[PDB]
Amino acid sequence: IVGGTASVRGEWPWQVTLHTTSPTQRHLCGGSIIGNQWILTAAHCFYGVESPKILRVYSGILNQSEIKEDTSFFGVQEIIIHDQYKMAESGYDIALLKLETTVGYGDSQRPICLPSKGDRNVIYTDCWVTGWGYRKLRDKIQNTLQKAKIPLVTNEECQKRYRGHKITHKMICAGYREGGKDACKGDSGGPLSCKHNEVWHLVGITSWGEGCAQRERPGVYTNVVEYVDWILEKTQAV
Numbered sequence: 236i237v238g239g240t241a242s243v244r245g246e247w248p249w250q251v252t253l254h255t256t257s258p259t260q261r262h263l264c265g266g267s268i269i270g271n272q273w274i275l276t277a278a279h280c281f282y283g284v285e286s287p288k289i290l291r292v293y294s295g296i297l298n299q300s301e302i303k304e305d306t307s308f309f310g311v312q313e314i315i316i317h318d319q320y321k322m323a324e325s326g327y328d329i330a331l332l333k334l335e336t337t338v339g340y341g342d343s344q345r346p347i348c349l350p351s352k353g354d355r356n357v358i359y360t361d362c363w364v365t366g367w368g369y370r371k372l373r374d375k376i377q378n379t380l381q382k383a384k385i386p387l388v389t390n391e392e393c394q395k396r397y398r399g400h401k402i403t404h405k406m407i408c409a410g411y412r413e414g415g416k417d418a419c420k421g422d423s424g425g426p427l428s429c430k431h432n433e434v435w436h437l438v439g440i441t442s443w444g445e446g447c448a449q450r451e452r453p454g455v456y457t458n459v460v461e462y463v464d465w466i467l468e469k470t471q472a473v
C-alpha cells in the first residue's frame with residue numbers, strides 16, 4: 236500500500252496473509268475470509284502453484300513478525316480458480332481457497348459480507364484497500380498491515396485511463412486523479428472493503444494497475460458483486 240497508514244489490531248478481521256512454503260516460506264498475496272472454510276482472493280496469485288499443499292493461510296495477523304514456525308495457520312484443501320480466468324488484465328481474477336479446517340470466529344478473525352444483488356445500484360463512499368505490499372514500486376513486503384481510503388471511479392472514467400485495455404463491468408476501479416494512495420506489489424488478492432449502512436462489504440479484490448499510485452491510473456479490482464452467483468455455486472455445492 237502506497238500512502239497508507241498502519242492498521243490497528245482487529246481493524247480488518249477478514250484480512251488474511253496467504254503464504255507459500257516452496258521453496259521457502261514467504262507472504263504471497265492477501266485474501267478475505269468469506270465463510271468458515273472459505274478465503275476469497277485473486278486467481279493470478281496461483282501462477283505456477285502446482286499444489287494446495289504449499290499454501291498456508293494466516294488470519295488474525297497485524298504484523299508479519301507474528302508468523303514463526305510455531306504460529307498456527309489454516310491448510311488449503313482445494314484451490315478453486317474461475318475457469319474463464321486467463322490473466323488479471325482480462326478479468327475473472329477470482330479464486331476460492333477451501334480450508335482443511337474451520338475458522339473459529341472471534342474479534343481477531345471473522346467474515347466480510349459479500350455485496351448484495353440489490354447493492355449493485357448503491358454508491359459506496361467509504362472504501363479501503365489493505366495489505367502488506369510495497370509502499371513504492373521497488374520496495375519490500377511491510378511488517379504491519381497498511382490501509383488507505385480510496386474513492387471508487389466509474390467504469391467510463393476507468394476506461395479513459397486505460398487506453399488499450401477493455402475495462403469490463405466485472406471490473407471495478409478506484410483511485411485519486413492525482414495518485415498518491417493505492418495498492419502495490421504484494422497487496423493483490425486482498426480486499427477493497429466498503430462500509431455501507433454501518434456494514435462492511437467486500438466490493439473488490441486487488442487485481443491489477445499500471446505501476447502503483449500513479450496519477451490517472453486507477454487500481455483495477457475484481458467487481459465482487461458480479462461473482463456472487465459464482466461464489467455461491469462453488470461454496471454451496473450440494
Ligand SMILES: COC(=O)Nc1ccc2c(c1)NC(=O)[C@H](C)CCC[C@H](NC(=O)c1cnn(-c3cccc(Cl)c3F)c1N)c1cc-2ccn1
Pocket residue numbers: 261262263264279280281282368375376417418419420421422423441442443444445446447448453454455456
Ligand atoms: C518476503 O516475501 C515477499 O517478498 N513476498 C512477495 C513479494 C512480492 C510479491 C509477492 C510476494 N507475490 C507474488 O509474487 C505473487 C505470485 C503475486 C504476483 C502479482 C503481484 N502483483 C501485484 O501485487 C499487483 C499488480 N498490480 N497491482 C496493483 C497496483 C495498483 C492498484 C491495484 Cl488495485 C493493483 F492491483 C498489484 N497490487 C506481485 C506480487 C509480488 C511481486 C510482484 N507482483
